[PDB]
């Protein structure tokens, strides 16, 4: 009898829910904060870096925001290893679509595929779910600039501005009160810094703890920029002047 | 969980208790084997004793058939201690591994590589839940392409290492001290030996180490001695007459 | 706790016992086999007024000469009936003749006990929890068979399934005669259904089907036939 050792991950509970998915969501909500928003100039993804030590190589080292394609990028909230697996899969999916159709995959389609992977894990087999939630931003000529939020259950939803991870309620309140339909890239970056500071419970953000990236569509090409410490510090000086 | 000691999964302290239990099962057989390494030879001595288990030693039992020493190849030998079925299974696995190596590479595997491949096979048992662990600990002796004696030891936990002298047995710390004393005594002598003298001295050292560790006089018919050397690279047992000669010499000196 | 293939200390399979518990509910149906044919009648527990009546049918056709009444879990019943239809069709294809009702019943039972995995493939994971009344006319004449989740097949002259199985069985036992004609069989079936029904027997809460020896063709009674039988029925006593 090996069934005594089985925990039955893909099984309903009396209230009609999945305990493993709920626990994965708890892990995600314990993870660090990742915010995203859409401006008229692009999609801005920011994240709070969890401090490990000052011996960490902080140069050219982004661990909470990743590039899935030239026109798609994502922010992670949850388990980094699960996130890496899903990110490799998403990169494979985007390249497979380009191989099949000679065009770049739409962001919604990529999100659907990765979320289908997550849902399949929650339904089939006897393996645990993925303890990761995604903020996938991107651009395509069909739906413009897009920002999606995906959770372990395979559920996903589109947003204009959102936050995931620890203390996401404060970030969501800040974004609700401040976000505007038409914003410039600089305004969006300043708002991202403000919401990161509010979620982290601080006044002056430290560039050593902030990951910032933005995906824009200029001169017919989609360009992703992952701000460095000096650029983030210039932004933080601007934010200090503003507030 | 409730089965952290039933399965090969970590306990809260980071331990794998099934490996420790398999090691205890090997230790409970009350079979002792001692391997010694010389300048150009390696010797393995063991007891022609039945591993303690549910069945006992019958009068009509053929005592020549009782053995814990096997030939992996013509030039590689081993001594296996543990549950007898597991020991036979390990011997067959090692033989098949050596034959596959020979066919694939056009030359004969050496003791180090054989032991490392066996431990790579054991790691899978340690990591997969649906398999039991093989309660078998082994010594392997051979001669490498550079004509040096190789003596390696592997345990149920998948750990292997090369030794100047090793022992599988119930008590190991005092056995280690005994072997250290014997090896220091051997190294104290400084005149170089011939190949035959080295062979004889290594065999005598192994026999004396086993006698000291077991703390009772050994009968030539109750122990088995196998040797490999540069003079004769084939892993060969020495006869009961030779064992008795060595025991009489040890007693008389 | 237990696997699906666990024996109880009394020699029974727990899952089969639980499926037997499952088959106890559902709309009540009766079946009567006489020399001139077999008639299956059933009550319709119409959920509400917004339901389309045609979309719910407790009496189905397994073949041109086989009708079936189902009780228990309706999804499992529909799966079983589809399997039986497929197999009867395949038999007709490979032999150019109408399958025997007994052979159809045996195939249904074989599928029903599929989860046991006694021969190595298996797809079902649990019993079906479905009870069937399969009637039809073959070269041996009209016959009526009862199948249950345990895989055991019985042959009845008159039988019942559903929630009022026991009351219907008592009425059938005390009112059925071997040499009845088809008209008396219809009267008896509708009388039992009227007795065991919660509502008042009418032309919209009961469905009937017949396979007559003469035509050997499944025939679903419509409002005209149902009403004529209801009129012929004697006043309740």
């Amino acid at each position: 009898m090996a069934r005594r050792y089985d925990s039955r991950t893909t099984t309903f509970s009396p209230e009609g829910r999945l305990y493993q998915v709920e626990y994965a969501l708890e892990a995600i909500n314990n993870a660090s904060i990742t915010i995203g928003l859409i401006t008229k100039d692009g999609v801005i993804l920011g994240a709070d870096k969890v401090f490990i030590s000052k011996l960490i190589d902080k140069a050219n080292n982004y661990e909470k925001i990743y590039k899935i394609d030239k026109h798609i990028f994502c922010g992670v909230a949850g388990l980094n290893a699960d996130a890496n697996i899903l990110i490799n899969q998403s990169r494979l999916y985007a390249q497979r679509y380009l191989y099949n159709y000679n065009e770049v995959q739409p962001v919604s389609q990529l999100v659907v595929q990765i979320c289908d992977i997550k849902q399949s894990y929650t339904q089939y087999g006897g393996l645990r779910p993925y303890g990761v939630s995604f903020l996938i931003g991107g651009y395509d000529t069909k739906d413009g600039y897009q920002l999606y939020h995906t959770d372990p259950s395979g559920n996903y939803s589109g947003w204009f501005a959102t936050a995931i991870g620890t203390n996401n309620l404060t970030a969501s309140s800040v974004l609700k009160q401040e976000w505007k339909n038409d914003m410039t890239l600089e305004e969006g970056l300043l708002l991202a810094l403000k919401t990161l500071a509010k979620s982290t419970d601080t006044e002056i953000p430290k560039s050593e703890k902030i990951e910032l990236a933005y995906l824009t569509n200029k001169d017919g090409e989609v360009y992703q920029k992952y701000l460095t410490e000096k650029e983030i510090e210039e932004l933080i000086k601007l934010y200090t002047q503003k507030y | 969980s409730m089965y952290d000691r039933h399965l090969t999964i970590f306990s809260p302290d980071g331990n794998l208790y099934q490996i420790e239990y398999a090691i205890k099962a090997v230790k409970n057989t009350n079979i002792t084997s001692v391997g010694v390494k010389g300048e150009n030879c390696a010797v393995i001595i063991s007891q022609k004793k039945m591993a303690t288990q549910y069945i006992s030693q019958d009068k009509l039992l053929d005592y020549n058939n009782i053995t814990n020493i096997y030939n992996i190849t013509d030039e590689i030998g081993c001594s296996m201690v543990g549950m007898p079925g597991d020991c036979l299974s390990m011997v067959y696995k090692a033989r098949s591994e050596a034959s596959e190596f020979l066919y694939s590479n056009g030359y004969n595997v050496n003791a180090e590589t054989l032991c490392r491949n066996i431990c790579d096979k054991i790691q899978v048992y340690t990591q997969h839940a649906y398999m039991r662990l093989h309660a078998c600990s082994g010594m392997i002796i051979g001669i490498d392409e550079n004509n040096k004696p190789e003596l390696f030891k592997f345990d149920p936990s998948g750990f292997c290492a090369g030794y100047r002298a090793c022992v599988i047995g119930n008590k190991e710390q005092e056995s280690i001290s005994v072997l250290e004393r014997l090896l220091e005594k051997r190294k104290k002598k400084i005149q170089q030996e011939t190949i035959d003298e080295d062979i004889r001295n290594t065999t005598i050292l192994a026999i004396e180490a086993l006698q000291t560790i077991l703390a009772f006089d050994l009968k030539a018919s109750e122990i088995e001695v196998a040797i490999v050397s540069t003079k004769n690279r084939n892993f060969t047992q020495i006869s009961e007459k030779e064992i008795d000669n060595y025991l009489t010499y040890i007693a008389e000196r | 706790d237990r696997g699906v293939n666990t024996f109880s200390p009394e020699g029974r399979l727990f899952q089969v016992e639980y499926a037997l518990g499952a088959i106890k509910l559902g709309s009540t149906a009766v079946g009567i086999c006489v020399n001139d044919g077999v008639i299956l009648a059933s009550e319709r527990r119409i959920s509400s007024t917004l339901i389309e009546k045609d979309s719910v049918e407790k009496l189905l056709s397994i073949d041109d000469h086989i009708g079936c009444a189902m009780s228990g879990l309706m999804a499992d019943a529909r799966t079983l009936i589809d399997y039986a239809r497929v197999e009867c069709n395949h038999y007709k294809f490979i032999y150019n003749e109408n399958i025997n009702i007994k052979s159809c019943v045996e195939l249904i039972s074989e599928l029903a006990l599929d989860f046991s995995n006694l021969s190595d493939k298996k797809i079902m994971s649990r019993p079906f929890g479905v009870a069937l009344l399969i009637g039809g006319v073959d070269k041996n004449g009209p016959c009526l068979w009862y199948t249950e989740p345990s895989g055991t097949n019985t042959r009845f002259s008159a039988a019942s399934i559903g929630s009022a199985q026991e009351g219907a069985e008592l009425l059938l036992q005390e009112n059925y005669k071997k040499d009845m004609t088809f008209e008396q069989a219809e009267i008896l079936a509708l009388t039992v259904l009227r007795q065991v029904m919660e509502d008042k027997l009418s032309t919209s809460n009961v469905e009937i089907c017949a396979i007559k020896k003469s035509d050997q063709t499944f025939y679903k009674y419509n409002t005209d036939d149902i009403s004529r039988i209801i009129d012929v029925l004697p006043s309740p006593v």
Binding site: K67, N88, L92, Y99 | - | -
Partner: protein
């Protein structure tokens, strides 16, 4: 040979002083003698420093290009760096040999820059040619491929000049390609020439014969 004659097409690559050039014919053929298109380019950009010229069966050209783009994009997104020209050349060789016993009927060339770091970066011209199962010829002056291989080899042997600026390199490669194409029935109908410099790419369409 007949399968290559079905479409025709030729690609050429040359090196200069701190520049390279890759040229191709623009025809698409059918049944070896029917011209269906005059804008079927055979040069594909993998990244800023890597170009591949694919000649041969058109379907195999498109398939191989899609595979190569897939592989290069995955490699570059994973590594967060542009793929090296030598790495791409070796990957192309291995991909071509992976179909050893049912190969793609394509004869490719790789033209680009090898980047060497010291502060500044040195750009070294890089040229390789292949046969259909990935046999690789690494060259420093010029590489050719296609049904016009003999004509291109003769023209490049006679006319190639070492260490030429971009203008002389363009003139030489254009003359080689045009003279070689003028002697081929199943190649021509326009010529496309790219000149790679570390800071810019010059794309030119040549006034060629269309007969």
């Amino acid at each position: 040979g007949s399968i290559y004659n079905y479409n025709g097409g030729c690609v050429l690559g040359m090196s200069g002083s701190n520049c390279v050039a890759i040229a191709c014919d623009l025809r698409l053929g059918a049944n070896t003698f029917t011209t269906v298109s005059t804008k079927f380019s055979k040069i594909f950009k993998m990244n800023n420093n890597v170009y591949v010229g694919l000649s041969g069966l058109a379907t195999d050209i498109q398939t191989l290009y899609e595979i190569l783009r897939y592989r290069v994009n995955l490699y570059e997104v994973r590594q967060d760096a542009e793929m090296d020209v030598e790495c791409f050349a070796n990957m192309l060789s291995s991909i071509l040999y992976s179909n050893r016993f049912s190969p793609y009927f394509v004869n490719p060339i790789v033209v680009g820059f090898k980047l060497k770091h010291y502060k500044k970066v040195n750009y070294e011209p890089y040229l390789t040619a292949y046969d259909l199962i990935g046999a690789k010829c690494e060259t420093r002056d010029f590489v050719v491929n296609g049904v016009t291989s003999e004509q291109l080899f003769g023209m490049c042997e006679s006319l190639y000049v070492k260490d030429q600026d971009e203008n002389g390199l363009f003139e030489t490669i254009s003359q080689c390609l045009l003279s070689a194409l003028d002697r081929d029935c199943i190649s021509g109908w326009g010529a496309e020439v790219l000149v790679l410099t570390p800071e810019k790419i010059i794309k030119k369409k040549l006034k060629a014969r269309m007969d």
